[PDB]
Write a protein that binds this ligand. Structure first.
Ligand SMILES: CC(C)ON(CC(=O)NO)S(=O)(=O)c1ccc(-c2ccccc2)cc1
Ligand SMILES: [Ca+2]
Ligand SMILES: [Ca+2]
Ligand SMILES: [Ca+2]
Ligand SMILES: [Zn+2]
Ligand SMILES: [Zn+2]
Length: 159
């Protein structure tokens, strides 16, 4: 195994908000993305408005304080660090993308599900049906499901 959180109670905080979307829509996309993983694990996620949080959610562009600069519009969409202190767990979204609640631009909810998978310790899948397969493609949000591979992976880490 790579690194895993050593507690099942995990906190998150949204550092800043993309101007591409309404604030309320960012909050909702992120909450629902955490819920996807909560639904198949003993993990419980709790939002912090101010102070220390395990998973910091950040929107930033270009070089933004870690060794992994974003690349402007297109290409890399986002990245996340595996479980750990400090930057460990943190999920970064490239502001040079256009984040949306729908099929236009790049869907924030779906991308966050993939990134939070990384924040929890998952690597990439070779199952094209898995959210951890490293190709972004819009599927509608109401019918989105984790694949059996995603579930096998996350349950192998927690529970
Ligand atoms: C390795 C590389 C091809 O993938 N990316 C870097 C990465 O792994 N960050 O997590 S990505 O940013 O392009 C990328 C690609 C796909 C997705 C993705 C996959 C499924 C659903 C939503 C987004 C997110 C980022
Ligand atoms: Ca980019
Ligand atoms: Ca962190
Ligand atoms: Ca943007
Ligand atoms: Zn980063
Ligand atoms: Zn990835």
């Amino acid at each position: 195994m790579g690194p895993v959180w050593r507690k099942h109670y995990i906190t998150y905080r949204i550092n800043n908000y993309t101007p591409d979307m309404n604030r309320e829509d960012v909050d909702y996309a992120i909450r629902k993305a955490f819920q996807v993983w909560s639904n198949v694990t003993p993990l419980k996620f709790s939002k912090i408005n101010t102070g220390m949080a395990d998973i910091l959610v950040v929107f930033a562009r270009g070089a933004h304080g870690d060794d992994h600069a974003f690349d402007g519009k297109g290409g890399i969409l986002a990245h996340a660090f595996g479980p750990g202190s400090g930057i460990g767990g943190d999920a970064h979204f490239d502001e040079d993308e256009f984040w949306t609640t729908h099929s236009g631009g790049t869907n924030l909810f779906l991308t966050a599900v993939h990134e939070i998978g990384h924040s929890l310790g998952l690597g990439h899948s070779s199952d094209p049906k898995a959210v951890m397969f490293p190709t972004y493609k819009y599927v509608d949000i109401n019918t989105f499901r984790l694949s059996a591979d995603d579930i096998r992976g996350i349950q192998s880490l927690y529970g």
